[PDB]
Amino acid sequence: DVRQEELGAVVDKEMAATSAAIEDAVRRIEDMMNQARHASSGVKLEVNERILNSCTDLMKAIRLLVTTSTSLQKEIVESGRGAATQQEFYAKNSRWTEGLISASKAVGWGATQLVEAADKVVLHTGKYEELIVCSHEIAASTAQLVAASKVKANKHSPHLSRLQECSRTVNERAANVVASTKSGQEQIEDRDTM
């Protein structure tokens, strides 16, 4: 249970860790594009490359959402702390800060989960179904990060509206990972049955 007086430090570190985890996810997924070309070939390799790329576009959209989330948090703090330090502001609004830490943590974990599901199905024997669920779950975690950020916000900068748009974009990208996995799966099972 995080000390109230160090909540500012912990949320700053958590947002930073979530962003690093998202960057690690982009690198791992992109590295699988090269590894796939060695685990498979043909229609399977082609659809897997498309799926890995949809996953990469989703992770880049999430990268932007988290960065915008951090920007909105910092403006909320700068605007409301007055003579207090950031630490004091976070401590005084401990509830809000805790929501940020918890929501951020979940996104980080969601990214790690999605990378693992992609790895298992593309390079091993995992199910495409698992990648689809992880796609839905990470989108759910980001919408929660957005709501947790929104609580102490208002129609202000670095735009609450910009963060909300970012969420729509992530949801659209997650839907694309799903459409891409379904499209690809039915393309793989349809080349073999002739």
Q: The domain spanning residue 19 has which CATH number?
A: 1.20.1410.10
Range of the domain at 92: 1-193
Tell me how far apart the alpha carbons of residues 8 and 107 are, in angstroms, rounded to a whole number. 19
CB atoms within 10 A of CB 161: 10
Write the burial class of residue 4 (CB in 10 Å: 0-12 exposed, 13-18 middle, 19+ buried): middle
Inter-residue contact 167 to 62 (CB < 8 Å): no
DSSP alpha helix (H) spans, 81-159: 86-92, 94-123, 128-150
Tell me how far apart the alpha carbons of residues 67 and 133 are, in angstroms, rounded to a whole number. 24
Inter-residue contact 49 to 57 (CB < 8 Å): no
Experimental method, per PDB record: X-ray
Inter-residue contact 162 to 68 (CB < 8 Å): yes
Structure resolution in Å? 1.9
Q: What share of the chain is helix, strand, coil (3-state, %, to 5)?
A: 85, 0, 15
Phi, psi of 93 (to 5 degrees): -115, 50
* Tally of domains within the chain: 1
Write the burial class of residue 149 (CB in 10 Å: 0-12 exposed, 13-18 middle, 19+ buried): buried
